[PDB]
Ligand binder design. Sequence first.
Ligand code: GQY
Ligand code: CL
Ligand code: CL
Length: 182
Amino acid sequence: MFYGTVSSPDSGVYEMKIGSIIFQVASGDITKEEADVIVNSTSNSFNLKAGVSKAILECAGQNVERECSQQAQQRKNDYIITGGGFLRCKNIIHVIGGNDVKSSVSSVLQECEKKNYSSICLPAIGTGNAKQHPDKVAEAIIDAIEDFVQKGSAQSVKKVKVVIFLPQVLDVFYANMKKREG
Ligand SMILES: COc1cc(N2CCOCC2)ccc1N
Ligand SMILES: [Cl-]
Ligand SMILES: [Cl-]
């Protein structure tokens, strides 16, 4: 039904269409990317600084750190939205690494439509301190995008890119894409 063909447009980058959306994967430092939204994978307190969350909070800066802890105290949040600080994005969406990854990605997609955003960059959510298994994480991320497309919800969102710190986790995402391709 929805899946196009897997190819490599640039060195180390792999992509396929899912309906109208270009889905891409690559290995690297997510804090060097430009996108409307960058996703952080963090703790239920939104103040973790290990792995991806270390890089994101250090580069984003202290105002973003402060924003996170202020929203954390205000209410019980499944995720929070902050400014981009000194990252190259309009907003950071901080999701809980231990939560259901499909649900987290669905929420990111819906929040990006609400802002008329076109591009998203996320890590392999949950594979860091939360210690979720890489193939379950890959299956969940791609399933969330498929569901969003199937329901006719894609309008402003055009590009979803996963930038993955460990090259061995990239392998797992590529194999999952190949399983689905048309
Ligand atoms: C940016 O996210 C990560 C970082 C690291 N490491 C930091 C550098 O030294 C040790 C590995 C390992 C896994 C992830 N996801
Ligand atoms: Cl994590
Ligand atoms: Cl990663």
